[PDB]
Design a protein around this ligand. Structure first.
Ligand SMILES: [Co+2]
Length: 120
């Protein structure tokens, strides 16, 4: 199945957001990232995707379709706005093995706050 995500300058959680910022998926699903506002992209964060998953980075302002294969958690960022909190968490399958690791990993404060919200 397909899950659509909007990339926005402003949304419910404040400035520079993915909506939704929590995406539940299964292997073989697609996540479609739509640049509703300009100035955004999607990029996998180093050491915060499952072992065996391929790294990815879209171009600024492109519609990007991600196919997810490996189970686990994926933290993705908008490259220009990572420091402003623009992230999403994709959970593929049940009980992602690397979720606690991602929560503990070094990242900007605003990112950590937003991440803890989405998990909660
Ligand atoms: Co952005």
């Amino acid at each position: 199945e397909n899950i659509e995500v909007h990339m926005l300058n402003k949304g419910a959680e404040g400035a520079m957001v993915f909506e939704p910022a929590y995406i539940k998926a299964n292997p073989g699903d697609t996540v479609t990232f739509i640049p509703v506002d300009k100035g955004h992209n999607v990029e996998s964060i180093k050491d915060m995707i499952p072992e065996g998953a391929e790294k990815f980075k879209s171009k600024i302002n492109e519609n990007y379709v991600l196919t997810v294969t490996q189970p686990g958690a994926y933290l993705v960022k908008c490259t220009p706005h990572y420091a402003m909190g623009m992230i999403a968490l994709i959970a593929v399958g049940d009980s992602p093995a690397n979720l606690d690791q991602i929560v503990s990993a070094k990242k900007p404060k605003i990112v950590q706050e937003r991440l803890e919200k989405v998990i909660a």
